[PDB]
């Protein structure tokens, strides 16, 4: 640009996980949001552990 | 009267998978016993994993090394999955120095467990595919812990402009079973079968973990039965 001498720049990146409040969806309309991150124990577990 | 069992049998198909059976029992009582064991076993045991990495010639988690087919991200990601074992007690934390300098495919067991204090169970995992000419230097830290810890907490250890902290899943257990079914004599009842299964990583036989879980659970109930401090 004519009136300016230089332009400097930086890039900033963020590695982003999941946490409560994020949105999820599927292929049939099931919009939703994460409510609770349950520990693995008390999830309902089938007859094969 | 109290129909005490005495039948505790082990069968141990392998170094890592084992069965157990409990015989004979008073009704409605084994479900309690087993579900308590399942929770404590699968929740609160102790293990080891790797936490920190220092690669030569790379400064951050998005670089790339010349001649190595994967990113640094995938190196860290699959290094996450390598399950370990002790051979000696009292091994707190360890640092390792790998110098892969030949036309190779860099695999897990290729890690010389060069420290005398510790070893690798799963040897046959593919870390990465080098070219004919890549030279790679890596430095490890392995440490003990419980449950699960994310990365940014592991920012505690002094990145020093190079160190990259990684996630760490410490749990030493993979699968647990219990099931119950009646057994009987004619006209006289109240025989119970408990059949239980422990599937681990191989870092420890099922018996030690099962013993430790029971030790903690009894240690809890001990205070809550005898001592009776009052308001």
């Amino acid at each position: 640009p004519a009136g300016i001498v230089q332009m400097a720049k930086v890039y900033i990146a963020k590695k982003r996980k999941i946490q409560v409040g994020d949105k999820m969806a599927g292929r049939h309309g099931n919009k939703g949001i994460v409510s609770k991150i349950v520990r693995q124990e008390d999830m309902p577990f089938l007859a094969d552990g | 009267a109290f129909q005490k069992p005495e039948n505790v049998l082990m069968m141990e198909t392998s170094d890592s998978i084992a069965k157990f059976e409990f015989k004979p029992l008073e009704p409605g009582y084994g479900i309690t016993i087993g579900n308590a064991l399942r929770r404590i076993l699968l929740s609160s045991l102790e293990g080891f994993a790797i936490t920190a990495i220092k690669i030569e010639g790379v400064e951050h988690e998005f670089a790339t090394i010349p001649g190595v087919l994967e990113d640094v991200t995938n190196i860290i990601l699959n290094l996450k999955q390598v399950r370990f074992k002790q051979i000696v007690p009292n091994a707190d934390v360890e640092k390792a120095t790998i110098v892969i300098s030949n036309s190779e495919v860099f695999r897990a067991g290729d890690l010389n467990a060069q420290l005398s204090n510790f070893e690798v169970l799963n040897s046959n995992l593919v870390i990465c595919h080098l070219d004919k000419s890549a030279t790679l230097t890596m430095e490890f830290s392995i440490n003990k812990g419980r449950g699960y810890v994310s990365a940014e907490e592991n920012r505690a250890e002094h990145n020093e402009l190079s160190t990259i902290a990684i996630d760490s899943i410490y749990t030493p257990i993979r699968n647990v079973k219990y099931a119950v079914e009646n057994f009987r004599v004619e006209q006289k009842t109240d025989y119970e079968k408990l059949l239980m299964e422990v599937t681990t990583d191989g870092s420890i036989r099922p018996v030690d973990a099962l013993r430790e879980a029971a030790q903690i659970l009894i240690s809890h109930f001990s205070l809550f039965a005898e001592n009776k401090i009052a308001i």
Side-chain angles (χ1 to χ4, degrees), chain B residues 6 26 63 190:
Chain B
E6 182 36 59
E26 298 187 3
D190 164 19

Short mmCIF file of all heavy atoms in Angstrom, two decimals, chain B residues 6 26 63 190:
data_model
loop_
_atom_site.label_atom_id
_atom_site.label_comp_id
_atom_site.label_asym_id
_atom_site.label_seq_id
_atom_site.Cartn_x
_atom_site.Cartn_y
_atom_site.Cartn_z
N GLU B 6 -16.10 -70.34 51.92
CA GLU B 6 -14.66 -70.54 51.98
C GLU B 6 -14.08 -70.76 50.59
O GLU B 6 -12.85 -70.76 50.43
CB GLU B 6 -14.33 -71.73 52.90
CG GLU B 6 -12.86 -72.05 53.12
CD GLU B 6 -11.98 -70.81 53.17
OE1 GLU B 6 -12.21 -69.95 54.04
OE2 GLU B 6 -11.06 -70.70 52.34
N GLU B 26 -24.92 -66.35 50.87
CA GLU B 26 -26.25 -65.98 51.32
C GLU B 26 -26.90 -65.04 50.32
O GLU B 26 -26.22 -64.20 49.73
CB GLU B 26 -26.17 -65.33 52.70
CG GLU B 26 -25.61 -66.29 53.75
CD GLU B 26 -25.66 -65.74 55.16
OE1 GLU B 26 -26.20 -64.63 55.35
OE2 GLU B 26 -25.19 -66.43 56.08
N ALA B 63 5.27 -28.69 14.03
CA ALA B 63 6.41 -28.71 13.13
C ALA B 63 6.38 -29.97 12.26
O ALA B 63 5.37 -30.67 12.18
CB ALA B 63 7.71 -28.61 13.92
N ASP B 190 -30.07 -71.38 48.93
CA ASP B 190 -29.20 -70.36 49.48
C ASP B 190 -27.77 -70.81 49.18
O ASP B 190 -26.89 -70.79 50.05
CB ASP B 190 -29.52 -70.17 50.98
CG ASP B 190 -28.45 -69.42 51.76
OD1 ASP B 190 -27.62 -68.72 51.15
OD2 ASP B 190 -28.42 -69.56 53.00
#
